[PDB]
Write a protein that binds this ligand. Structure first.
Ligand SMILES: [Cl-]
Ligand SMILES: [Cl-]
Ligand SMILES: [Cl-]
Ligand SMILES: [Cl-]
Ligand SMILES: [Cl-]
Ligand SMILES: [Cl-]
Ligand SMILES: [Cl-]
Ligand SMILES: [Cl-]
Ligand SMILES: [Cl-]
Ligand SMILES: [Cl-]
Ligand SMILES: [Cl-]
Ligand SMILES: [Cl-]
Ligand SMILES: [Cl-]
Ligand SMILES: [Cl-]
Ligand SMILES: [Cl-]
Ligand SMILES: [Cl-]
Ligand SMILES: [Mg+2]
Ligand SMILES: [Mg+2]
Ligand SMILES: [Mg+2]
Ligand SMILES: [Mg+2]
Lengths: 386, 386
């Protein structure tokens, strides 16, 4: 059998760029919990002993930006200078242009309102896992989530919040469909305390992290493991390693599979097409595959500022479609409402009080079963069987 | 003929995120001009009346970070609050951890040194344009470059630095190769002064910008034009619109085509595999197509921190290869040196004094003919003809 190697990575919730995504979305969630119509463009950056929140917010909400920063950092585990940031003592620069909504005198609706910006977004799905995501991405991501889990539940209390994971999968191409054969290489680089030995780290990573996450059918005697290959990782988080919102957009989506239109998600209210548009095209690609039309699907949408209807839509099934891609395009266009105001309503994205967006801001926006991930709910599609 | 629509965008050099990429790379260039061995991880952010440079630099160079910020902003055209940032008067926060190199007492080499980080990178090429780039990306990008050109040479002196462009191309798929048929939709949203009328903007955009850039063979009576569709754009740049380094990574690469591994380029010295690795795989994909092995090619490489050899390589020719992809993979692996220390040397990336990286930081890292873009020089590949 002819195979090829495809790699995806993940970063842990303590990585300084991901920290910024989480802070940005914790701010967004706080705004929406009080004011579903909040306009939010909240950017975060961080470096040694400092977090700055910036950007623009128009809201009726009363939000303690500094407290959200500190609470978000503390819950991730940044409780001291030694672990890479002291949530209680670090500098927090609050640099947001805060506005209340416009006051106007006079006597646009979701059906007619134009996009708030131009741009393009892609959705992807593949039948190679039950959540219709690429296995290389799923496994890298799940290793990261597992590192967080065993640190917070005390199973591996030697762990610290920062770290990275990476999985190389050996694939076969079946008529355009991606068929995972085996895991070729697993890499973990995790932050840890100054007492645990290299031997304890390697044994615990194998037994508490890799073994539970990676199906045994994909592991064999030849699988390569790189476990903290560069040696010690005691220093982490923002300490000596600046972070910014929107610097993990491939980890947030499909891990190199599919495509990306460039726009980050975190800190953006769900009227913004970079977020709602990307979520709708995930729902569309996932629905094409789940309804049986194809084994794999890529969907693009694009917008112009001030225009409600998309400028373009395509569908590509990588030759796996059971009906022509032009027919799948017609069905997608008829079944999905790509108008900006309508996307936000149909995915129930303004609904407050469930911490929805902070949940998205680590360990991927796609492939998760939580009911707040409304874009993961398949839409039933009618299709003229071949 | 069966066609589909594919969209790519661009932003102008005055867009606040792109401003940050340019500042970050102007800092990098200044470091390398004096000290080719500089370690640079320079991040920039901006908001109304402020730029902050941050991150980490180890260098022997003496660099006036604030002066580089102001010079970079001024040359782009940010000369007043009215045009979106006053380069001479705005706040510049210098927040870099500056170090000199380690002082050590004792009696690694490029061949043996490990990658500085993990991650994966993709290269792409396509025979649909002479520079072996996707037409949707090339045209969006060239419209942006043209807007800058006619503003700076006074042809359209009403222009201001910020703006965005977007092109939808109608394509045909010929045996996996992408064949552009026509331009379906052109969008331009440009910043401008308070005197020019909407009619003058639309006429000058058509005649001075669109007509010279887009080959007439791709334009017809049905092509849709959206010219400043949301109305006036007098306010721009950082004014009310926060920017950050590394938020335009799809514009920096392939416009939705190919793939992306996630890592930004700007502000990173060329020992960093996110930059050198991505540049080498562009050279490899371009070389596969230019040597006649394929019409289209995608190449991935991946790395582990502390390991010199890549963890994985793949090649995909989208069924356009004239020899099997496994044979093209063998040729690429034999012909290219993917070791981090060697990539930097073979692409001559430390060479100082030519403003190389600032040139990359607007209007795309790929598809340009300038001799400093060493990764655009095709390597001759020997291949066992079919
Ligand atoms: Cl403070
Ligand atoms: Cl308002
Ligand atoms: Cl509108
Ligand atoms: Cl928007
Ligand atoms: Cl300790
Ligand atoms: Cl360390
Ligand atoms: Cl369309
Ligand atoms: Cl819908
Ligand atoms: Cl200042
Ligand atoms: Cl040093
Ligand atoms: Cl090394
Ligand atoms: Cl690196
Ligand atoms: Cl004016
Ligand atoms: Cl305006
Ligand atoms: Cl390989
Ligand atoms: Cl080489
Ligand atoms: Mg308070
Ligand atoms: Mg980073
Ligand atoms: Mg000075
Ligand atoms: Mg932005």
């Amino acid at each position: 059998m002819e195979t090829f190697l495809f790699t995806s990575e993940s970063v842990n919730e303590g990585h300084p760029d991901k920290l910024c995504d989480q802070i940005s979305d914790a701010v967004l969630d706080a705004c929406l919990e009080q004011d579903p119509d909040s306009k939010v463009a909240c950017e975060t950056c961080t470096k040694t002993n400092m977090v700055m929140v910036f950007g623009e917010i128009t809201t009726k909400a009363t939000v303690d930006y500094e407290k959200i920063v500190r609470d978000t950092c503390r819950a991730i585990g940044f409780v001291s200078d030694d672990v890479g940031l002291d949530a209680d003592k670090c500098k927090v620069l609050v640099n947001i242009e805060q506005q209340s909504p416009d006051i106007a005198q006079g006597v646009k609706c979701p059906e007619e309102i134009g996009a708030g910006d131009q741009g393009h977004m892609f959705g992807y799905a593949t039948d190679e896992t039950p959540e219709l995501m690429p296995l290389s991405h799923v496994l890298a991501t799940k290793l990261g989530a597992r590192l967080t889990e065993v640190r917070k539940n005390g199973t591996c209390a030697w762990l610290r919040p920062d770290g990275k994971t990476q999985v190389t999968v050996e694939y076969y191409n079946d008529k355009g469909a991606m068929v995972p054969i085996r895991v070729h290489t697993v890499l973990i680089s995790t932050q840890h305390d100054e007492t645990v030995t290299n031997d304890e780290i390697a044994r615990d990573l194998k037994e508490h992290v890799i073994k539970p996450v990676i199906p045994e059918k994909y592991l064999d005697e030849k699988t390569i493991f790189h476990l903290n290959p560069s040696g010690r990782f005691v220093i982490g988080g923002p300490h000596g390693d600046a972070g910014l919102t929107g610097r993990k957009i491939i980890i947030d989506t499909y891990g190199g599979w599919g495509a990306h239109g460039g726009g980050a998600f975190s800190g953006k209210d769900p009227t913004k097409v970079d977020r709602s548009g990307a979520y709708i095209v995930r729902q569309a690609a996932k629905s094409v595959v789940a309804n049986g039309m194809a084994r794999r699907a890529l969907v693009q949408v694009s917008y112009a500022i001030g225009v409600p209807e998309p400028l373009s839509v395509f569908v590509d099934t990588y030759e796996t479609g059971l009906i022509p891609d032009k027919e799948i395009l017609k069905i997608v266009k008829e079944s999905f409402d790509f108008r900006p105001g309508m996307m936000t309503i149909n995915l129930d994205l303004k609904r407050g009080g469930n911490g929805r967006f902070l949940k998205t801001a680590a360990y991927g926006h796609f492939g998760r079963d939580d009911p707040d991930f409304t874009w993961e709910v398949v839409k039933p599609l009618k299709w003229d069987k071949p």
